[PDB]
Design a binder for this molecule. Structure first.
Ligand SMILES: NC(=O)c1ccc[n+]([C@@H]2O[C@H](COP(=O)([O-])OP(=O)(O)OC[C@H]3O[C@@H](n4cnc5c(N)ncnc54)[C@H](O)[C@@H]3O)[C@@H](O)[C@H]2O)c1
Ligand SMILES: NC(=O)c1ccc[n+]([C@@H]2O[C@H](COP(=O)([O-])OP(=O)(O)OC[C@H]3O[C@@H](n4cnc5c(N)ncnc54)[C@H](O)[C@@H]3O)[C@@H](O)[C@H]2O)c1
Ligand SMILES: [K+]
Ligand SMILES: [K+]
Ligand SMILES: [Zn+2]
Ligand SMILES: [Zn+2]
Ligand SMILES: [Zn+2]
Ligand SMILES: [Zn+2]
Lengths: 373, 373
């Protein structure tokens, strides 16, 4: 049978504090649940935001982490698609394949377990984590900051057994999102003129996608010029820093492209830049995709004239990929060398040093740091 | 040769004043211009806006009117596609067929003569209108409030010689716009659930378009319940008055459609309703099209979350129809009874009574008033 597992996990006892390396207890999988041995997990600003406690719906204590890759340790009752030994990637965006969202080809927003997941609980309404006699909450349905985690069976992507887990763990977030933003949401045509605001892992993935789609011009935008070199390696035809111009960035872009770009992607989470991104789009057919996640309460704005004259405002969640069926295919595209993953890894750390990943982010020197479990 | 024509015209000497029936002079067409005898003209909210004095780009004295139908009286040098006697409809959205916009299948916003047209002048930079020794400006490149007008040769649609002009003049604006918003901009699929905000001529045309596209549900929304009866005749499956509910209209719509509509159309020009229209759209795939023209300076807003979770914000100008090639086909759709036109006419007046159209308009008792020249 599946017995309780005692392992290590990085616990966030409270907001605004460093993660704590603790010894925790991980209950066996219940019906339709999967316990996964996490081999590698990445860290990104999403975890840091929740950690800062700025997230109104963020609760503690909790085990963060949403970019993981590992191996199925055991499955609960009724699980037949997965088995111990299967190579997998936990997904914060599940795919039950039965709800109205999963059945609609235009979205990937499965709502099957959203409510419980939002409360850091499994579908049955409880947590599988405990530490020092206290219940510890799950996070984004994945909690990859643990040697072992339990997730809903519909939050699992079975992938190629040969995939390097210390790499593909990044397909659990940034890469897949940016890439999909370009090919699924925007669906840009060959020859398209693009602008990408924010050159972090998400922006680079968008550039990668724009290149795959055959974009003619890809203009990278970031206030941190250190991001430019890698952006060009990914395919950006040129990069500009808004700080080097006195006019609003959208005016600069409009001037550089004789009217504006065909497609723009905001990968920062700044509502003022989102507006700029929209207005930087060419009249008549310009399309702007919001990828960044703005702070709660903030809102975007513009004059309706912008839309009436042809521009379209869109958004994306996890690049629009129906998670369970897409992630494996994304892993295969990486294996076949169609897309990149390795190039996103800027730093590597051991589990005990996980907190260093946060310092790296606050230094502005990282795309994606990989932490070895 | 082509002589100066002395005729009557409804002149707007100044903002905030009613139109004046004056004796004017209409110069002969210069190179690439067409002089048209206006047989019928309608009046719509656009004209009134300029007349009010609120339009920041409105100048006087000027001859308004952009919804007309007539007969070519004579053509200027270099014109071979058109000849005296041809049945036509003046277009405020031209189609030179050569510029970047005309060449692009995704837009209908020809920019060839925009500059001069915005100044109420012909392409050569001058006006063909004079009255009591003063130059009178052109309006929207059409100036249909005159027995005779002169337009750029690229601002003309040659139509079916059998079309009743006291009817098809309406295809010069409202009907074509609303209809196109549904079939060109939204391109809704059969079975779609739609919501239409504003049940005037534009909203009714949208409904007509939704019905032609095979929508399963068409929910009309207007604060004036007198608009409901005609909306249902056009195909609205039901009509609701936001004033009858205590919660935001978007919540009402979400509730009655189990998540929101597939497509919504704002046909009012109210930025608050535009937001509601966007938020009334179903998560994951909802699309909202802004058709209404908000007062300059006003802005639309919402939380990026709405877009990130799948909703798309669009706009439309003249229903996205490439004017010159489309209008004739729309007249044919009317002639073959595919679309309606007659049903939009609520009142008829003689030229001398033109000002009553504005009164009818503001009283809220009209869809479209047709003025017989
Ligand atoms: N939609 C989704 O499914 C989804 C998924 C993952 C992440 N995201 C969001 O994507 C965004 C980017 O993720 P990331 O990992 O790349 O973060 P990141 O911090 O590493 O990258 C942000 C980049 O934007 C740059 N930037 C900041 N302000 C700027 C400005 N005013 N102008 C130009 N550049 C500016 C930053 O310097 C940095 O290079 C975040 O908002 C993240 O929450 C969305
Ligand atoms: N995009 C274009 O190319 C284009 C072309 C023509 C007209 N328009 C714009 O379309 C809009 C509508 O034109 P129209 O001729 O049908 O105008 P209309 O005034 O006759 O119809 C507007 C309707 O909206 C209703 N309404 C007003 N406030 C409302 C509210 N709060 N909630 C629900 N309904 C409300 C009014 O009762 C009226 O029935 C105007 O803004 C016009 O300028 C745009
Ligand atoms: K596209
Ligand atoms: K569509
Ligand atoms: Zn991440
Ligand atoms: Zn589902
Ligand atoms: Zn009109
Ligand atoms: Zn043109």
């Amino acid at each position: 049978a599946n017995e309780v597992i005692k392992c290590k996990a990085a616990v966030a006892w409270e907001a605004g504090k460093p993660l704590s390396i603790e010894e925790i207890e991980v209950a066996p999988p219940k019906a339709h649940e999967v316990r996964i041995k996490i081999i590698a997990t990445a860290v990104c600003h999403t975890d840091a935001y929740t950690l800062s406690g700025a997230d109104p719906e963020g609760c503690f204590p909790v085990i963060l982490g949403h970019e993981g890759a590992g191996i199925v340790e055991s499955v609960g009752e009724g699980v037949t698609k997965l088995k111990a030994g299967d190579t997998v990637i936990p997904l914060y965006i599940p795919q039950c394949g039965e709800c109205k969202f999963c059945l609609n080809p235009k979205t990937n927003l499965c709502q099957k377990i959203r409510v419980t997941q939002g409360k850091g609980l499994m579908p049955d309404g409880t947590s599988r984590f405990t530490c020092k006699g206290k219940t510890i909450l799950h996070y984004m349905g994945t909690s990859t900051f643990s040697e072992y985690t339990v997730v809903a069976d519909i939050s699992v992507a079975k992938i190629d057994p040969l995939a390097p887990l210390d790499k593909v763990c990044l397909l659990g977030c940034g890469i897949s999102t940016g890439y999909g933003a370009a090919v699924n949401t925007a669906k840009l045509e060959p020859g398209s003129v693009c602008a990408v605001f924010g050159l972090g892992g998400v922006g680079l993935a968008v550039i990668m996608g724009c290149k795959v789609a055959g974009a003619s011009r890809i203009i990278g935008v970031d206030i941190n010029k250190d991001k430019f070199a890698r952006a060009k390696e990914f395919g950006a035809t040129e990069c500009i820093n808004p700080q080097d111009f006195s006019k609003p960035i959208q005016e600069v872009l409009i001037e550089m492209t004789d009217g504006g770009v065909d497609y723009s992607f905001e990968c920062i989470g700044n509502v003022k830049v989102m507006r700029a991104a929209l207005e930087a789009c060419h009249k008549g057919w310009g399309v702007s995709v919001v990828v960044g996640v703005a702070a709660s309460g903030e809102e975007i704005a513009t004059r309706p004239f912008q839309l009436v004259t042809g521009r379209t405002w869109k958004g994306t969640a996890f690049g629009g990929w129906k998670s369970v069926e897409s992630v494996p295919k994304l892993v295969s595209e990486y294996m076949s060398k169609k897309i990149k993953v390795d190039e996103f890894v800027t730093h590597n750390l051991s589990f005990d040093e996980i907190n260093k990943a946060f310092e790296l982010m606050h230094s502005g020197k990282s795309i994606r740091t990989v932490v070895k479990i």
